[PDB]
Design a protein around this ligand. Structure first.
Ligand SMILES: [Cl-]
Ligand SMILES: [Cl-]
Ligand SMILES: [Mg+2]
Ligand SMILES: [Mg+2]
Ligand SMILES: [Mg+2]
Length: 297
């Protein structure tokens, strides 16, 4: 259903000195749901129930996000892709996931999960993705309506826009959900970013890592590598397409449609499509997993 309640209470593991938070429910091989910017495990609350009894249902909060601890010191060099990967790789190792993981990914969760999959391919049973950073892009490929604002985040304007005015949370997020959010929903998204200043840095560092027009070169190289790998990987895939969508449209969507061993559905939504079409998304994921894990009830 739609609904503002969280899916479970947070659990905690110590990673590199910092407590990291994650949702963990059920038993069996993992189904690992990974949010991006500026969300948390909360993004998946109405999707995870569809997988009840199909696996161990896990949704991690990235470092500095959700209920995971903030890094200190923080500033413009903090919360880059590589640092998020360092923490997330360690958390995923700590969770004792085994070798039949189904990844369910969105936004920067897809960049992180696609790279992890490339590096751990024998451990990935299937990949469900939506509104993903599937490859390096050009500014022409970026949604027109928020193009100027994302170039501003990437400029020195970003500190005022995000650290002081919290634009990513307060404007971009609700602007890329078709339906109006309730107070309680918006409160869950605001919670990690209530405080002005470096508490909000993850939401500014993230748009500064998007691989656009060859910059930043280090993330472009990472995405070029997972794009090349996914396009010839035999791992089963589920592409949850969106209309109108946002990022996984145009050239990127065409590229994703070339990937082998893939199923597709289309749901209504812009970018944070989990808030518009959770039951359609969840049902597709559950069907995918049932195929991958035949129960013979
Ligand atoms: Cl971003
Ligand atoms: Cl660069
Ligand atoms: Mg209690
Ligand atoms: Mg501590
Ligand atoms: Mg001014």
């Amino acid at each position: 259903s739609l609904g503002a309640k969280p899916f479970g209470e947070k659990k905690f593991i110590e990673i590199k000195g910092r407590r990291m938070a994650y949702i963990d429910e059920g038993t069996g091989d993992p189904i690992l749901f990974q949010h991006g910017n500026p969300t948390s495990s909360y993004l998946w609350r109405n999707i995870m129930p569809h997988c009840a009894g199909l696996g161990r249902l896990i949704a991690c909060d990235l470092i500095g996000m959700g209920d995971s601890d903030k890094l200190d010191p923080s500033g413009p060099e903090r919360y880059a892709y590589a640092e998020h990967r360092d923490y997330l790789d360690a958390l995923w190792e700590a969770l004792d996931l085994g070798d039949r993981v189904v990844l369910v990914v969105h936004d920067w969760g897809s960049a992180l999960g696609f790279d992890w999959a490339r590096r751990h391919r024998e451990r990935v049973q299937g990949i469900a993705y939506m509104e993903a950073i599937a490859m390096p892009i050009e500014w022409a490929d970026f949604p027109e309506q928020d193009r100027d604002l994302f170039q501003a985040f990437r400029s020195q304007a970003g500190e005022e826009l995000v650290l002081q005015d919290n634009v990513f949370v307060e404007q971009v997020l609700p602007g890329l959900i078709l339906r109006p959010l309730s107070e309680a929903e918006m409160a869950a998204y605001r919670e990690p970013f209530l405080a002005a200043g470096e508490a909000r840095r993850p939401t500014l560092s993230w748009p500064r890592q998007i691989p656009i027009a060859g910059t930043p070169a280090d993330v472009v190289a990472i995405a070029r590598d997972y794009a090349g790998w996914l396009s010839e990987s035999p791992i089963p895939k589920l592409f949850i397409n969106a209309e109108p969508g946002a990022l996984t449209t145009g050239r990127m969507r065409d590229f994703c449609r070339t990937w082998p061993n893939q199923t597709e559905i289309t749901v209504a939504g812009a970018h944070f499509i989990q808030e518009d079409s959770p039951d359609e998304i969840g049902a597709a994921i559950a069907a995918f997993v049932r195929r991958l894990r035949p129960a013979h009830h």
